[PDB]
Amino acid sequence: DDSLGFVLIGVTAVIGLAWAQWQSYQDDGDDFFDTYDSRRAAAA
Amino acid sequence: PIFTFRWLTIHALAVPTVFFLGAITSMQFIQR
Amino acid sequence: MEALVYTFLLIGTLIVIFFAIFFRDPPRIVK
Amino acid sequence: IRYWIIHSITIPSLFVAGFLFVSTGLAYDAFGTPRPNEYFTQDRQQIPLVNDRFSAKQELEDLTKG
Amino acid sequence: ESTGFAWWSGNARLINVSGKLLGAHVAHAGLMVFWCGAMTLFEVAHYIPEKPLYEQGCILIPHLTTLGWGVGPGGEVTDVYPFFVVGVLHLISSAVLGFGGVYHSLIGPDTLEESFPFFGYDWRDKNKMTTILGIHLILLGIGSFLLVAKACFVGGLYDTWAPGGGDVRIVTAPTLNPLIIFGYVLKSPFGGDGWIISVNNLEDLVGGHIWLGFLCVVGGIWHILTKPFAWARRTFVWSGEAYLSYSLAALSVMGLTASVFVWYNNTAYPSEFFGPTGPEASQSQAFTFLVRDQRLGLGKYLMRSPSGEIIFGGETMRFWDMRAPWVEPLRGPNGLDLNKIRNDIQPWQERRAAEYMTHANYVSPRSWLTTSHFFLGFFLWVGHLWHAGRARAAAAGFEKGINRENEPVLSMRPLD
Amino acid sequence: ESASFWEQFCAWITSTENRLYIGWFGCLMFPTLLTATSAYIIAFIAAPPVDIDGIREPVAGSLLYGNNIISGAVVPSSNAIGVHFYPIWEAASIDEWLYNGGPYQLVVFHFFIGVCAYIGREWELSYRLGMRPWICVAFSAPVAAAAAVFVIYPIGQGSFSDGMPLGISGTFNFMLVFQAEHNILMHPFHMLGVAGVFGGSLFSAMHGSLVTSSLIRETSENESLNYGYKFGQEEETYNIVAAHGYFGRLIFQYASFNNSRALHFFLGAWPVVGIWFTAMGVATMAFNLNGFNFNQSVVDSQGRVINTWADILNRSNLGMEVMHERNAH
Amino acid sequence: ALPEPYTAFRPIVDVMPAIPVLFLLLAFVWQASVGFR
Amino acid sequence: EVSFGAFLAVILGLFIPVVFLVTLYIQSEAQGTATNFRLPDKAPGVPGDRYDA
Amino acid sequence: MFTLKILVYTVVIFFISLFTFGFLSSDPSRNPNRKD
Amino acid sequence: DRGVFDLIDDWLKRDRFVFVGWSGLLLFPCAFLAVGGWLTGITFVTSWYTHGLASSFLEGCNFLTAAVSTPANSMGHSLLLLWGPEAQGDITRWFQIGGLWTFVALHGSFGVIGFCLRQFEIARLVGIRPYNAIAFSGPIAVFVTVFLVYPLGQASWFFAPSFGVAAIFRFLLFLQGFHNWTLNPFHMMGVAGILGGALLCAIHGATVENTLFEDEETYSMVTANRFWSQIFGVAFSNKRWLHFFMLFVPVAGMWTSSLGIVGLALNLRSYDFVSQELRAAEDPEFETFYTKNNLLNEGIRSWMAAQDQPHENFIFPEEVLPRGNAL
Amino acid sequence: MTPSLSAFLSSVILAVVIIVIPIGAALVFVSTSD
Numbered sequence A: 001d002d003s004l005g006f007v008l009i010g011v012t013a014v015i016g017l018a019w020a021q022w023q024s025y026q027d028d029g030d031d032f033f034d035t036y037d038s039r040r041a042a043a044a
Numbered sequence B: 001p002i003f004t005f006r007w008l009t010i011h012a013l014a015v016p017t018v019f020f021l022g023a024i025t026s027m028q029f030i031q032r
Numbered sequence C: 001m002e003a004l005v006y007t008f009l010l011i012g013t014l015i016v017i018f019f020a021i022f023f024r025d026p027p028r029i030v031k
Numbered sequence D: 001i002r003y004w005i006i007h008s009i010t011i012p013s014l015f016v017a018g019f020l021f022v023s024t025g026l027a028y029d030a031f032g033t034p035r036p037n038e039y040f041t042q043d044r045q046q047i048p049l050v051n052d053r054f055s056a057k058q059e060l061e062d063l064t065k066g
Numbered sequence E: 001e002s003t004g005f006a007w008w009s010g011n012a013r014l015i016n017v018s019g020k021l022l023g024a025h026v027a028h029a030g031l032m033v034f035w036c037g038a039m040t041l042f043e044v045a046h047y048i049p050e051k052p053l054y055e056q057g058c059i060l061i062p063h064l065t066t067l068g069w070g071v072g073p074g075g076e077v078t079d080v081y082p083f084f085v086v087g088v089l090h091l092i093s094s095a096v097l098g099f100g101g102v103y104h105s106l107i108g109p110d111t112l113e114e115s116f117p118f119f120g121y122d123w124r125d126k127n128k129m130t131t132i133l134g135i136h137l138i139l140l141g142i143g144s145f146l147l148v149a150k151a152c153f154v155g156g157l158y159d160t161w162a163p164g165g166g167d168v169r170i171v172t173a174p175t176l177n178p179l180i181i182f183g184y185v186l187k188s189p190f191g192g193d194g195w196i197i198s199v200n201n202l203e204d205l206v207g208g209h210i211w212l213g214f215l216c217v218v219g220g221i222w223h224i225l226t227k228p229f230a231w232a233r234r235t236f237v238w239s240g241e242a243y244l245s246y247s248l249a250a251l252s253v254m255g256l257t258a259s260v261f262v263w264y265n266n267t268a269y270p271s272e273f274f275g276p277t278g279p280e281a282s283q284s285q286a287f288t289f290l291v292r293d294q295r296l297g298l299g300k301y302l303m304r305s306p307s308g309e310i311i312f313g314g315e316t317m318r319f320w321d322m323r324a325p326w327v328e329p330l331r332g333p334n335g336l337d338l339n340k341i342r343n344d345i346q347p348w349q350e351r352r353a354a355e356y357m358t359h360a361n362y363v364s365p366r367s368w369l370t371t372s373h374f375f376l377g378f379f380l381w382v383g384h385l386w387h388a389g390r391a392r393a394a395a396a397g398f399e400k401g402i403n404r405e406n407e408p409v410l411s412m413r414p415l416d
Numbered sequence F: 001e002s003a004s005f006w007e008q009f010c011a012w013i014t015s016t017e018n019r020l021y022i023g024w025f026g027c028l029m030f031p032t033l034l035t036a037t038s039a040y041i042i043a044f045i046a047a048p049p050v051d052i053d054g055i056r057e058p059v060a061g062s063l064l065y066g067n068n069i070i071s072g073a074v075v076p077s078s079n080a081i082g083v084h085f086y087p088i089w090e091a092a093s094i095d096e097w098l099y100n101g102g103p104y105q106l107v108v109f110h111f112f113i114g115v116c117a118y119i120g121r122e123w124e125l126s127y128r129l130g131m132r133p134w135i136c137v138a139f140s141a142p143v144a145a146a147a148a149v150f151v152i153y154p155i156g157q158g159s160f161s162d163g164m165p166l167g168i169s170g171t172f173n174f175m176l177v178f179q180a181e182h183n184i185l186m187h188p189f190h191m192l193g194v195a196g197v198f199g200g201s202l203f204s205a206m207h208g209s210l211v212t213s214s215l216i217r218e219t220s221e222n223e224s225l226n227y228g229y230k231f232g233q234e235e236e237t238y239n240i241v242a243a244h245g246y247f248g249r250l251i252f253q254y255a256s257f258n259n260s261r262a263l264h265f266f267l268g269a270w271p272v273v274g275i276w277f278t279a280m281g282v283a284t285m286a287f288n289l290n291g292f293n294f295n296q297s298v299v300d301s302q303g304r305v306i307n308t309w310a311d312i313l314n315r316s317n318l319g320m321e322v323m324h325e326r327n328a329h
Numbered sequence G: 001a002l003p004e005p006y007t008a009f010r011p012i013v014d015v016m017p018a019i020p021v022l023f024l025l026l027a028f029v030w031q032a033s034v035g036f037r
Numbered sequence H: 001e002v003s004f005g006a007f008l009a010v011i012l013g014l015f016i017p018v019v020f021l022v023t024l025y026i027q028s029e030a031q032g033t034a035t036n037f038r039l040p041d042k043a044p045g046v047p048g049d050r051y052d053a
Numbered sequence I: 001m002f003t004l005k006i007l008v009y010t011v012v013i014f015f016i017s018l019f020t021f022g023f024l025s026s027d028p029s030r031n032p033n034r035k036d
Numbered sequence J: 001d002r003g004v005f006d007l008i009d010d011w012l013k014r015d016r017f018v019f020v021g022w023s024g025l026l027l028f029p030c031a032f033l034a035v036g037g038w039l040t041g042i043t044f045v046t047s048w049y050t051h052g053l054a055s056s057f058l059e060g061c062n063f064l065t066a067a068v069s070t071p072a073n074s075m076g077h078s079l080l081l082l083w084g085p086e087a088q089g090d091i092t093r094w095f096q097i098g099g100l101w102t103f104v105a106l107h108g109s110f111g112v113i114g115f116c117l118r119q120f121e122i123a124r125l126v127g128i129r130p131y132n133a134i135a136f137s138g139p140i141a142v143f144v145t146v147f148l149v150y151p152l153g154q155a156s157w158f159f160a161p162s163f164g165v166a167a168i169f170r171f172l173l174f175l176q177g178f179h180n181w182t183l184n185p186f187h188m189m190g191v192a193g194i195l196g197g198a199l200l201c202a203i204h205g206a207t208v209e210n211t212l213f214e215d216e217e218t219y220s221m222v223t224a225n226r227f228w229s230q231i232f233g234v235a236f237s238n239k240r241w242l243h244f245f246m247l248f249v250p251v252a253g254m255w256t257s258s259l260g261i262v263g264l265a266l267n268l269r270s271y272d273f274v275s276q277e278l279r280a281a282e283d284p285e286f287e288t289f290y291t292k293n294n295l296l297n298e299g300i301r302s303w304m305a306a307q308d309q310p311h312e313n314f315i316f317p318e319e320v321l322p323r324g325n326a327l
Numbered sequence K: 001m002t003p004s005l006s007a008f009l010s011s012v013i014l015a016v017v018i019i020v021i022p023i024g025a026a027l028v029f030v031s032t033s034d
């Protein structure tokens, strides 16, 4: 562990895979015409 | 003409202010 | 023992702050 | 109408009176403010300070003379 | 007042009005170019040939002589005609921008949406907004390549680190290796490292500008040809105030960075037209005094750093990371070599430090640039806070106040 | 079908039912402020003296080394460090880290991150509650002042040693040395800051006295009047027209704020702008753009210098300056 | 040290910097003339 | 030189007003008047109902 | 000494990643005036 | 009404362009003379014969450096009346000995009495409680203690603040160097009240404007209480207690700092920590920020005393002037 | 009667006859008029 990018890559992976699991059931494929996206899928 | 309370109050401020303003302007031309 | 008194006073102040935050009077909205 | 004609005369007269109160040196004599050439004299090279309470008037006159 | 904004917030009425917004932006750009040309003319009108540029309160002329216009060896100013032609070119360009801005603001189309659909936009049109950003990114990448032309083909850039006192040097081998460039970008911002301010040579500068221009042009092409992804669409606010707030945050970052840049950096801001830096002036005082001591018959002036380094002692020991073109010929592998100090000392190196020590009511142009752009950067961060909050609250819909009927807090559980 | 762990985590983090709102900004705020608090308390109680100057004479700042609460401080980092990053792992020993003023760097950096995240957290809770988001802009002024006093002035001076010590007497020492070196009292931005602070106290006392004066009678003969206000009531708790009439007759009738909204904007804006300007003044004096210099501005006809009050102020600055430069030559 | 054929344009040069500032005051007097509409 | 009188000044200057405030609050809890989220007095000596009631 | 650097780096990156991925988790939707 | 007193009472309380009242008989001439006397002094009157300074616009001073300087130290605590035994009716000598300072201070002191009486009178006329008069007692206590009580305990009127911008700046550094006024716990309570009052002004104005209702009450107290309970931990729930608190903390800051100025009048200052001073004397390596501050106070005192107190004729050679080079 | 005592007596007389009595007379006049 000479360079310290393993900590950066490793931890951002673990939280990133958790975020990716949340993103999987987000039906965000359709585009919206608004100032912000109100669509957020809850409870899987 | 008008010598009421309104006249006496604001002339008590305006008369020395204009006189002082002329005196301040004269000090700007004092060579120091 | 002066530093002990100073530390006791500061820790007591922080304890009072903790109790004032978490054991405060609960605000109730009038009806 | 008479509001402006008074203030077209009295206001410049007052500004002029203030101007000729300083430029004629009357302000220095009235208030005791020294001119730039009389902060120090030939016989007095130090700061002129009042050292006695009840002789302050006399002390100033024998020190500001000439 | 019927638009919802008073006179003191009057430019907020142009958010949906695209044509008048274009007119206002072009008019402001014309004002910027007008100030540029007018200041260049003002600085060349008051320029005294014998005095250095940093003694005459010049900020715009020092930037022009860093590009190799009217420069000589050692930093001497030769001819003010290139500065004059630059100022008059910006002054002529300002009149074109001012007329176009006033036309588009006053007599042009109000909203250029029904006509000219290429120029018409909506703040929520995520495809159209990435196109404008892509076009302007391509333009900025082209502009970054104009410096590369000035550095490698047209004339050259004034290299303050050139031997003998600096000269306009043509760069033929820019540092194209991305490891060095992005290690400069990813460098620590603390002492010794200094992030991107520690660019100490022209090669790294022109190579980084090559990489930045390539990145900007490919990013502009990409933003023109693509659309925001789902994560970007769900993360951001798509409104004019939001885009203004993002630009305000970016501009605040750039303002603070440039203030510390002109305060510390010696390469892009040489100590011949901008004057010495603070650390430079302190080490100049120490070095000049050591020169006088060695001449007129040394641990009194130097000290042993714990890192195997020889640096000046006293109060200037905190500036031991200062690098100057007039110290480096006397600096070897371990720092200040005593044999190099006593023998390799040159008359050109001692006059510079003799000048810098007495130029540490005088305010250096480095101080003016640092303080002014720091002030602007902080207040632009404040503006980012204001406009980001207002954009988010206006997008959500409660920027006008809390609805008395459906108050959100009244529907929540008690806190305790 | 089962909700993901990230969804439950996001629901708990941005929950408005927590006793203290956490939020995504609080994910940065709480650990940084907690480690800064723990480090500050430990360093204030017990910490060996820090050699701030570099001439091997250390300054004691902890209670266990002969300080009281007034004189105790977390001494700034050593002059040898300057603006170098100095974590614990970059020091050869813990003793050398404590000798060079490392706890100052630790506390200051974590505190700065914590207060920026506090600004963001204030915006975040204002967003979750559906209110207008400009309280964080008001908090940006003391944050700017703390940034100028702890980070930006060391950046301009080139060393964290001349940053403000984390103590009472250290704060006074910073003020005296800053006045000696830059004449902050004659800086127009410090005048704007003093105007903002004095005016803020004036307007706070004025508004409070005006509202307290015109409270509508709802309680008994000697019961506390604060029971006359019910939490969550809709009607006004004080007579606005009576207070406005009193304030109009007090100075002149045109200066009475007929709108409570404009008055409250003025109350929120005056000390915030004043503190903004004094923060920018302190941070601009870091780059040697000092205050007004009216030294030897009056001379007589023969060239002798007549002192003014600025000359006496300069004499005080000179005394503090020659005592600050401890064996500089 | 202006160029030789344009030295007669020296006085107008010193007031060229102040024109951007008075554009800001131009916006204030325009609103004051219209009655802050 | 531990000042003996100074120790009592800190201790008794803190203990006595803390005791007075604590004693006042506890008898206020017994009377049901130790909250500000209650109505004004219905009658002399009769505290009003709490907002939650 | 290197172990302390490892743990501090991991904790700092963990909290920054929490902040970053949390603000990417459809933050503008988490407001009381949500349309649906 | 009936009786000559009632017609005067009716005329004084009549609704006109400015309220007069009975307090205006004392406030209006005294405040006009104090402000007019101050403007006269900063324009024409010098301080050459009392302080050895130029302090007027006539001598070349600007607004920052002009002042109405205190009387000479030889005057003592004399009232310095124009007809008094010092000036003896001479208006010119009255200006030179600093009689204009006692003119401004005494007429200003009766001016702030008249203004506080005016606050009582309008509150009785409108019919509200006199809490603005109680709040103004803070500035009254600060003016009375600093400009009257502090010089009355000192040697003379000379050591009072002079009515000027840079002259006040000297008075700040004078009390720091000679009294260690920053280390006084009463000034510390004053700083907490004044900075707390500015905090309360900023935080209340921001909260009201940011919890407004889109348009009885104009802002949501429930939303504001919920916001600060989760941000700060505690929050205001009573609007009446919130506004008494906005009165209390800056006024209590004025009153607490005024008590320390009274102690400073008799040199009953919090200058030193004796145990910390004794330990540094026996052990020269011991050094805290308090000990460094006492070194800066010695630097203030010795380097200003020659010119700040020219009546004493202090002659300090360079050997006895404290320096950092001699530690 | 020393000069300071005479000056004090003159000051009291002057205060009464230049400040107190004229202001009181003016107040009586404007109160009976209006």
Ligand code: CLA
Residues within 6 Å of the ligand: E007, E008, E009, E010, E011, E012, E244, E248, E379, E380, E381, E382, E383, E384, E386, E387, E390
């Ligand atoms: C590129 C930057 C930029 C842009 C395009 C905008 C655009 C906008 N802003 Mg935003 N803003 C910015 C930067 C910007 N702002 C910065 C840096 C701050 C922090 C100070 C703000 C804080 C801010 C607030 C608080 C408000 C806006 C508002 C607005 C809108 C109305 C414009 C207006 O009110 O003009 C009117 C211009 C004036 C009345 C003149 C202002 C001059 C001030 C008083 C002095 C500034 C100093 C100046 C240099 C003079 C100094 C002279 C010196 C020698 C003494 C408009 C959408 C309003 C908005 O929120 O509604 C949508 C509004 O209320 N802005």
Ligand code: CLA
Residues within 6 Å of the ligand: E006, E007, E008, E009, E010, E011, E012, E013, E014, E020, E021, E023, E024, E025, E027, E028, E095, E098, E099, E102, E105, E106, G024, G027, G028, G030, G031, G037
């Ligand atoms: C950078 C400065 C700037 C610019 C470019 C603009 C731009 C604009 N504003 Mg804003 N504004 C500003 C600053 C600015 N504003 C400031 C500081 C304030 C606070 C006082 C405002 C307050 C404000 C309000 C309240 C309103 C605007 C409006 C407008 C728009 C309509 C203008 C109009 O009808 O004017 C008409 C002006 C005139 C008839 C008098 C000026 C005549 C011309 C323009 C002078 C040009 C001189 C120049 C030398 C010409 C060179 C030409 C030559 C080179 C050939 C326009 C896009 C309006 C709006 O938002 O939408 C309609 C509006 O209601 N502004």
Ligand SMILES: CC1=C(/C=C/C(C)=C/C=C/C(C)=C/C=C/C=C(C)/C=C/C=C(C)/C=C/C2=C(C)CCCC2(C)C)C(C)(C)CCC1
Residues within 6 Å of the ligand: E027, E028, E030, E031, E034, E041, E088, E091, E092, E094, E095, E097, E098, E099, E101, E102, E105, G006, G009, G012, G023, G026, G027, G030
């Ligand atoms: C819309 C509007 C606005 C705006 C406007 C603007 C902003 C404008 C701009 C404009 C501009 C920006 C302009 C410019 C101009 C310029 C000019 C017109 C130029 C000319 C030039 C010349 C003439 C030159 C000459 C010369 C030479 C060549 C050489 C040297 C000398 C001289 C310099 C002389 C306002 C706000 C007001 C109001 C509202 C509306």
Ligand SMILES: CC1=C(/C=C/C(C)=C/C=C/C(C)=C/C=C/C=C(C)/C=C/C=C(C)/C=C/C2=C(C)CCCC2(C)C)C(C)(C)CCC1
Residues within 6 Å of the ligand: E181, E182, E184, E185, E196, E199, E204, E205, E206, E207, E208, E209, E211, E212, E215, E235, I019, I020, I021, I023, I024
């Ligand atoms: C020119 C030059 C150079 C440079 C180069 C380069 C290549 C650069 C680049 C640069 C870069 C490359 C930059 C980047 C940046 C980035 C950034 C700045 C970022 C930011 C981000 C953001 C802003 C985000 C945010 C967020 C989060 C975090 C979460 C969610 C939400 C949001 C999205 C908001 C050098 C120095 C070498 C040298 C000299 C010259």
Ligand SMILES: CCCCCCCCCCCCO[C@H]1O[C@H](CO)[C@@H](O[C@H]2O[C@H](CO)[C@@H](O)[C@H](O)[C@H]2O)[C@H](O)[C@H]1O
Residues within 6 Å of the ligand: E361, E362, E363, E371, E372, E375, E376, F188, F284, F289, F290, F291, F292, F293, F294
């Ligand atoms: C864009 C905002 C940038 C903010 C940066 C800070 C600006 C505010 C600083 C105000 C005081 C600056 O003061 C600095 O510039 C003044 C320019 O006249 C000079 O100050 C001096 O100016 C004149 C002589 O030159 C004289 O009136 C005085 O001796 C003095 O006022 C000094 O060079 C320096 O004291």
Ligand SMILES: [Fe+2]
Residues within 6 Å of the ligand: F211, J208
């Ligand atoms: Fe209120």
